């Protein structure tokens, strides 16, 4: 019973996780915009 | 003392047992706590020895089980005859058998199967069969479809009677044990009636029906003009015109003036020149001779009237100096254990099926088989493969007898007891033969494969270079050529033209030809002996050491089928009698896979091929077997790479399905390696982490999942390994010959 097998310490919104994820998602949309010649 | 005792209403006929699976055993009956229960439900279904200790219930289950099995075979045979009636080109095949291919299957006009329906002659677009049923029905004397239709219906009726019998003999009228133990009555009845009278009747059919029908159809008579079989019985003038022996009647038979029947009972001993096939008159003389022999042979045993032998007396009196008590105690084994009887009946029946394949190719016994090279290979291959499987089963049940039914009291200093005592000497010497043969038989290929690459053909083990001629087989061949007029004075021709004689050409194709044995055949016959000995080493060791070993003294209490006994003693893995059988099947495959290739390449190279009218034979590969079959690269180059061209290029044609299953078979073979190489210890851990995902999403199963057992993983592998292995050669042999 040294290490708990389940993690702890996070709130519902998960702000830090979402901020970097949405950024990575934005680059993908940008490269897609270059593919469809939108830009 | 061979009475008929039958119990009244042993078990009901309710449907309730169908509802509850696992009624076999007390363990399975409890419940399916894990998924291994599912796999165990099947692996024990036909293992009646485990369900009940009462030997009566074992025999009653088995006797009824055979009846349901015969229903399956009869339904199968009836379906072949039915397909010959409706979806077939048989009626067109009779008019022009040489230039028309035989077909019995038609795919439907759907997504693109319809390409498989190809022009096989006779206005029929369908798949070309290789079973040879067309040659069988012709030899039976069937000349129209309705006559072929009636035979199919009788099989289905016959199927129901078998199916009714098993119900009748398990639910209503169950024999007791001692009814089964009357082996002396079993042998008289099977020898004289099933084999004797069954052959006797067929002699009546060949004489009345087949031989006149075949003779008229062979002499150029159109099928429309050929009379029906019933007319021969009523009108005897027809038979007298073809076979004048009937004019004398039955009086020469009883007065022993059997020379009058020389017209339709002969010893020509050769093939009919017009149709590649043995003379029907010889096949009539054939069955007549054997029925007398079987009918005589059956009366040996006693069967309630005091006249005959007790088989116990014959065995016990066959002792000797080197064997202490001789066969004392064996009769109790064969009568006590069903497994021992299965081992004998299955092993020798397997060897028959191989012997049958060998006699049939050299002596084609049906009309127009020899010209149909496709039907000969598929028949020769299928029978060898069947016999190979059965021989392996004989060793398995031999071990099951030793683990379960072997009693030391009965087998006390008998023949079996002594064999177990010196099992070490039997295997150590057999081991020496396997190494001796493997070095010599196969190493000589490596020497030729090495010397040819170095550029030293002078040093090869070839026909021009250093040569190993099979002088003994060349000599035994010569005697059979000179036996007609010599040691077989009443024989006109040699028994088979394979031993010698002259070329026989049915149409443009050659039916049979002398098979000259060179140095290449010397090596291959030892390769076959090599692979057979190792297969016996694996299987025989499985039988003797199934009960005990120096490594494991108590192997019986663990059972016949167990994976291991721990990682102690080094490693005790694959030590069971089951695991020996699992290994022998790979060698049975390697043993027989060379046999079909030795047959396929040699017959294509030396025997089969078109023959010119002037007397020149053009074989399919043109002597490729002599110089190339002495090296492994030749089998890779001239046999596998060359003959597989039609298979891969079959796409977009009627043979395209062969190229697919040829390809799909390679998948299953590799899919087998996933199970053989791997192990359960990995797979239960992977299923563990996958169960976590289901416990997360609440999709967890009630029946807890479990990886396949150890011996099951070996069982699944050899299943795929043989299925994907054999199916590859199946399509390779089909498509290569159907094009050629």
């Amino acid at each position: 019973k040294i290490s708990p097998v389940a993690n702890t310490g996070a709130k519902p919104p998960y702000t830090f996780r979402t901020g970097w994820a949405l950024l990575l998602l934005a680059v993908n949309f940008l490269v897609a915009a270059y593919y469809f010649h939108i830009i | 003392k061979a009475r008929v005792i039958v119990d009244k209403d042993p078990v009901p006929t309710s449907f309730e047992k169908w509802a509850q699976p696992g009624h076999f055993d007390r363990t399975l009956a409890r419940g399916p706590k894990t998924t291994t229960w599912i796999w165990n439900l099947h692996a024990l279904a036909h293992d009646f020895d485990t369900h009940t200790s009462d030997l009566e219930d074992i025999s009653r289950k088995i006797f009824a089980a055979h009846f349901g099995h015969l229903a399956v075979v009869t339904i199968w045979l009836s379906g072949m005859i039915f397909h010959g009636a409706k979806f077939s080109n048989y009626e067109a095949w009779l008019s022009d058998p040489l230039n028309v291919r035989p077909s019995a299957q038609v795919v439907w006009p759907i997504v693109g199967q319809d390409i498989l329906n190809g022009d096989v002659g006779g206005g029929f677009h369908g798949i070309q069969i290789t079973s040879g049923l067309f040659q069988v029905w012709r030899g039976w004397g069937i000349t129209n479809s309705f006559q072929l239709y009636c035979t199919a219906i009788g099989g289905l009726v016959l199927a129901g009677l078998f199916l009714f019998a098993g119900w009748f003999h398990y639910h209503k009228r169950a024999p007791k044990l001692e009814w089964f133990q009357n082996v002396e009555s079993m042998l008289n009845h099977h020898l004289q009636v099933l084999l004797g009278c069954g052959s006797l009747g067929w002699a009546g059919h060949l004489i009345h029906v087949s031989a006149p029908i075949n003779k008229l159809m062979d002499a150029g008579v159109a099928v429309k003009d050929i009379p029906l079989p019933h007319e021969f019985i009523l009108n005897k003038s027809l038979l007298i015109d073809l076979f004048p022996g009937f004019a004398a009647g039955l009086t020469p038979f009883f007065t022993l003036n059997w020379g009058q029947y020389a017209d339709f009972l002969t010893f020509k001993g050769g093939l009919n020149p017009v149709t590649g096939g043995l003379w029907m008159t010889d096949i009539a003389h054939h069955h007549l001779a054997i029925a007398v022999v079987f009918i005589i042979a059956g009366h040996q045993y006693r069967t309630n009237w005091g006249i005959g032998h007790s088989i116990k007396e014959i065995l016990e009196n066959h002792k000797g100096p080197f064997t202490g008590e001789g066969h004392k105690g064996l009769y109790e084994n064969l009568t006590t254990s069903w497994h021992a009887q299965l081992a004998t009946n299955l092993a020798f029946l397997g060897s028959l099926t191989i012997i049958i394949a060998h006699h049939m190719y050299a002596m084609p016994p049906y009309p127009y088989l020899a010209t149909d090279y496709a039907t000969q290979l598929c028949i020769f291959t299928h029978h060898i493969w069947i016999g190979g499987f059965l021989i392996v089963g004989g060793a398995a049940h031999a071990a099951i007898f030793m683990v379960r039914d072997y009693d030391p009291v009965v087998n006390q200093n008998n023949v079996l007891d002594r064999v177990i005592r010196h099992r070490d000497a039997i295997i150590s010497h057999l081991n020496w033969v396997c190494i001796f043969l493997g070095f010599h038989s196969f190493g000589l290929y490596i020497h030729n494969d090495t010397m040819r690459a170095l550029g030293r053909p002078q040093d090869m083990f070839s026909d021009t270079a250093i040569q190993l001629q099979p002088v003994f087989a060349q000599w035994v061949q010569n005697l059979h050529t000179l036996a007609p007029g010599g040691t077989a004075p009443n024989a006109l021709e040699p028994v088979s033209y394979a031993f010698g004689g002259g070329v026989l050409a049915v149409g443009g194709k050659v039916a049979m030809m002398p098979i000259a044995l060179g140095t290449a055949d010397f090596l291959i016959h030892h390769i076959h002996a090599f692979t057979i000995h190792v297969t016996v080493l694996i299987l025989l060791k499985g039988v003797l050491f199934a009960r005990s070993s120096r490594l494991i003294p108590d192997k019986a209490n663990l059972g016949f089928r167990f994976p291991c006994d721990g990682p102690g003693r080094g490693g005790t893995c694959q030590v069971s009698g089951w695991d020996h059988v699992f290994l022998g099947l790979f060698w049975m495959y390697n043993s027989l896979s060379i046999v079909i290739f030795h047959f396929s390449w040699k017959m294509q190279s030396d025997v089969w091929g078109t023959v010119d009218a002037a007397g020149n034979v053009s074989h399919i590969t043109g002597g490729n077997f002599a110089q190339s079959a002495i090296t492994i690269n030749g089998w890779l180059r001239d046999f596998l790479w060359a003959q597989a061209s039609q298979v891969i290029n079959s796409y977009g044609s009627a043979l395209s399905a062969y190229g697919l299953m040829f390809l799909g078979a390679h998948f299953v073979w590799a899919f087998s390696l996933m199970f053989l190489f791997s192990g359960r210890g990995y797979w239960q851990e992977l299923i563990e982490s996958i169960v976590w995902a289901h416990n997360k999403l609440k999709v967890a199963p009630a029946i807890q999942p479990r990886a396949l057992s150890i011996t099951q993983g070996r069982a699944v592998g050899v299943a795929h390994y043989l299925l994907g292995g054999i199916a590859t050669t199946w399509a390779f042999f089909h498509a290569h010959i159907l094009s050629v």
């Binding site: - | 449907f15 309730e16 169908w18 759907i110």
Partner: protein, 43 residues
């Protein structure tokens, strides 16, 4: 009784066999009339 027979169909193989045959029959039915489809046609 009839209840015993219904449970036999309720088992996995007979239930799986009837369902997959009904499932397979629909696809073989559709490919018969409507022969070949690789994409939905575009209005």
């Amino acid at each position: 009784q009839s209840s015993y027979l219904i449970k036999f169909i309720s088992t996995a193989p007979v239930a799986a066999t009837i369902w997959l045959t009904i499932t397979a029959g629909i696809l073989i039915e559709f490919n018969r009339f409507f022969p070949d489809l690789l994409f939905h046609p575009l209005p």
